[PDB]
C-alpha cells in the first residue's frame, strides 16, 4: 500500500506507513535512500567497453560485435578499421557480417571518439547509430578528432539522426566522394563551440553536384542542417517535431491525438481530457492542465471516477458526483459511499 489519497491536494501521495535483484526490464534506482526498481523506457541502461587505446580491441570485427548487444553507452571508443570489416585473408579472418552492425541501434552515447574508416558497400548511411545522441570525446583519435569519417566511398548521408551534442574534439569528414547533406550542417550547435579550426571537411562530393541532383535538406528542416533526406533526418525543425520527425504542426485544434507544444515538440495530452474542436485542449501533459474534463473533476485534476473507497490518512475516502461532475465529499458519518451531500443519500 504505497499510495494514499490526500484531501488537500486531491490526488494520491506516497504512504509513509507502507535484498533481491531487479528484473531485466527494471533498473535499480535510489529514491532518497530507498532502494527500488524502476521500469526502463525500452532497453535498460547498460555500459559496455569500447575500442581503440586502453582496450584489448583495435577494431570492431566479427570476434567482438556480438558483445555490443543491448549496449546503450560505450565507456570508450568505436573503431571501424578496414581489417575489421573486410577481414584479413593473411590470417584467415572472415569479413564482418553487415547485419551484425544493427547491434549499435541501441547505442545512445559514446564516451570517447567514433572512428569510421570502413563500411559495407550496401549501407549508404550510418543509420545503425540513429539512436546515438551524444559523443563525449573524453578520449580522442589521431589529432584530437572525436568524429572521423574518411574514405567511405558508398555513404550517401551520415544518418546520425539523434546526434545533437559533441562535447569536445575536432571533426574529420573527408574522402567520401559520394556524401551529401553534410554541407549545410550547423556544427556550432553540435560542438558547443565556435568551430575554430575544428572542422576538417574536404574532398567529398561537391555542393554543386549535390544541389543539382536535388539531394539537399528537406524543406521542413530549419537552417541547422540535416543528416540526410526526409523530415526525420533534420537536426532542428522549422516548426514542430512529433517523435523525432519534423512536422508542419502539432494537433492543437484537430488530430488523431490532441497535442500540446513544449519547446517546439508535440506531446500527446492526458486521456482524461475532453477533445476540444477549434480551441486548445491542454496546456501540458498533466491531468490538471486540460481545458475541459472528459468525465469528472476531482479538485484540479480530471479523473475518470470519484474516489469511492480509496484509502486516506484517516480512512476510506468517498466522494459523490455533483450536478456538474465535480467529485464532492460524502457526509462524514456515512459508510460505503453515498449519492449526495445529505445524510439519507448514503449507502
Amino acid at each position: 500500500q504505497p499510495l494514499v489519497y490526500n484531501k488537500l491536494t486531491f490526488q494520491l501521495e506516497p504512504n509513509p506507513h507502507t535484498v533481491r535483484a531487479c528484473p531485466p526490464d527494471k533498473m535499480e534506482v535510489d529514491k532518497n535512500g530507498l532502494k527500488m526498481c524502476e521500469p526502463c523506457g525500452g532497453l535498460c541502461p547498460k555500459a559496455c567497453e569500447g575500442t581503440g587505446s586502453g582496450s584489448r580491441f583495435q577494431t570492431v570485427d566479427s570476434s567482438n560485435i556480438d558483445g555490443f548487444v543491448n549496449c546503450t553507452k560505450i565507456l570508450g571508443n568505436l573503431d571501424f578499421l578496414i581489417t575489421g570489416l573486410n577481414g584479413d585473408p593473411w590470417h584467415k579472418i572472415p569479413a564482418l557480417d553487415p547485419e551484425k552492425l544493427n547491434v549499435f541501434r541501441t547505442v545512445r552515447e559514446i564516451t570517447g571518439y567514433l572512428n569510421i574508416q570502413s563500411w559495407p558497400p550496401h549501407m549508404h548511411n550510418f543509420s545503425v547509430f540513429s539512436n546515438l545522441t551524444t559523443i563525449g570525446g573524453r578520449s580522442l583519435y589521431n589529432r584530437g578528432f572525436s568524429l572521423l569519417i574518411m574514405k567511405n566511398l558508398n555513404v550517401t548521408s551520415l544518418g546520425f539522426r539523434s546526434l545533437k551534442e559533441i562535447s569536445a574534439g575536432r571533426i574529420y569528414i573527408s574522402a567520401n566522394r559520394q556524401l551529401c547533406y553534410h554541407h549545410s550542417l550547423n556544427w556550432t550547435k553540435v560542438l558547443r563551440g565556435p568551430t575554430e579550426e575544428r572542422l576538417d571537411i574536404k574532398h567529398n562530393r561537391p555542393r554543386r553536384d549535390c544541389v543539382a541532383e536535388g539531394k539537399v535538406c528537406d524543406p521542413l528542416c530549419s537552417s541547422g542542417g540535416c543528416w540526410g533526406p526526409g523530415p526525420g533526418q533534420c537536426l532542428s525543425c522549422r516548426n514542430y517535431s512529433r517523435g523525432g520527425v519534423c512536422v508542419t504542426h502539432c494537433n492543437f485544434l484537430n488530430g488523431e491525438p490532441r497535442e500540446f507544444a513544449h519547446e517546439a515538440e508535440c506531446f500527446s495530452c492526458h486521456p482524461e481530457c475532453q477533445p476540444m474542436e477549434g480551441t486548445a485542449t491542454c496546456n501540458g501533459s498533466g491531468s490538471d492542465t486540460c481545458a475541459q474534463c472528459a468525465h469528472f473533476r476531482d479538485g484540479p485534476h480530471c479523473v475518470s471516477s470519484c474516489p469511492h473507497g480509496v484509502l486516506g490518512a484517516k480512512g476510506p475516502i468517498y466522494k459523490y458526483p455533483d450536478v456538474q461532475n465535480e467529485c464532492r465529499p460524502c457526509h462524514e458519518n456515512c459508510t460505503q459511499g453515498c449519492k449526495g451531500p445529505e445524510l439519507q443519500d448514503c449507502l
Partner: antibody, heavy 124, light 108 residues
Framework: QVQLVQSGAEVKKPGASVKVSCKAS????????MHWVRQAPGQGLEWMGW????????NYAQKFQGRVTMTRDTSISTAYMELSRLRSDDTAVYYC?????????????????WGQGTLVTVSS | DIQMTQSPSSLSASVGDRVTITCRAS??????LNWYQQKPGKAPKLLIY???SLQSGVPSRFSGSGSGTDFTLTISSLQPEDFATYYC?????????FGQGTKVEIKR
C-alpha cells in the same frame, strides 16, 4: 644509408631570390614528405612548409605564404625551395628535413633525417 | 599557433646527473610532441617522437612522458655526448612550433 645533400652557401641582396636544393639518396624519394626548416644565427627553429614529393602538393606557413615556392625533381630525387622577396631578417641556415612517415595522415611530423644546412646571408 | 614554452632556458649539470626539461603547450595537443638535440653547428637530431616513443638509435637513457599540455624530456646519467641544445616540437596543428630550447652546460 639515408642522406640529404643541400646546395652551397648563398649571399643575396635585399629584394633578390634564393633557391636552395636538397638532393636525396638512400630511400624512396616519393615516399616521405620533405619539410623545410630555417634557423636564424643563434636563434630557435622555424618551420616554413612541406612538399609532397609524389603529388607536388605544398603547405606553406602563413608568414611565408606568397613568397616561397617549393618544387620537386623526382627524376634526380631533389627538392627545391625558392624564397623570394628577401629581407634582412631572412638571414638563416635553411635545412631540409624528411617526414618519418609514409602515410602522412598518421605521421607525427618527426624529422629523422636532415640536410647539411645552407647558409643564406641577406644584407645590403 | 600553439606556442611552446620550454623550461629552463639554460641548465648547468655534470656528467652523471639526471636532468629534466619541460615543454608546455599553450593548448591541448594530445600526444603530438617530439624532442630534438642540436649539437653546436650541426643539424638537429630526433630523440623522442610521439611524446614517449624513442627513436631508433637514441640510447635508452633518453625518455619522454606527458600528454595534453605538460610534456617532459628526462635523461638519466648525463654523458659528454649529451651536452647540447634540446628543442621540443609540436605537430598537432598545421604549423609545427618549436620551443625556445634548453641548453645543458658542463658544471664546473
Amino acid at each position: 644509408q639515408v642522406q640529404l645533400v643541400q646546395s652551397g652557401a648563398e649571399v643575396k641582396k635585399p629584394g633578390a631570390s634564393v633557391k636552395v636544393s636538397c638532393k636525396a639518396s638512400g630511400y624512396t624519394f616519393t615516399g616521405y614528405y620533405m619539410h623545410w626548416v630555417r634557423q636564424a644565427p643563434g636563434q630557435g627553429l622555424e618551420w616554413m612548409g612541406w612538399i609532397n614529393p609524389n603529388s607536388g602538393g605544398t603547405n606553406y606557413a602563413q608568414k611565408f605564404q606568397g613568397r616561397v615556392t617549393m618544387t620537386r625533381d623526382t627524376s634526380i630525387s631533389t627538392a627545391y625551395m625558392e624564397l623570394s622577396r628577401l629581407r634582412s631578417d631572412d638571414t638563416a641556415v635553411y635545412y631540409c628535413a624528411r617526414d618519418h612517415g609514409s602515410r602522412h595522415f598518421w605521421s607525427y611530423w618527426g624529422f629523422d633525417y636532415w640536410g647539411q644546412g645552407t647558409l643564406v646571408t641577406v644584407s645590403s | 599557433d600553439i606556442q611552446m614554452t620550454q623550461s629552463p632556458s639554460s641548465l648547468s649539470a655534470s656528467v652523471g646527473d639526471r636532468v629534466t626539461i619541460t615543454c608546455r603547450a599553450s593548448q591541448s595537443i594530445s600526444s603530438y610532441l617530439n624532442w630534438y638535440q642540436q649539437k653546436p653547428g650541426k643539424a638537429p637530431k630526433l630523440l623522442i617522437y610521439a611524446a614517449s616513443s624513442l627513436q631508433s638509435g637514441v640510447p635508452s637513457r633518453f625518455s619522454g612522458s606527458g600528454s595534453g599540455t605538460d610534456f617532459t624530456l628526462t635523461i638519466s646519467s648525463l654523458q659528454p655526448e649529451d651536452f647540447a641544445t634540446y628543442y621540443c616540437q609540436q605537430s598537432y596543428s598545421t604549423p609545427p612550433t618549436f620551443g625556445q630550447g634548453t641548453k645543458v652546460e658542463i658544471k664546473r
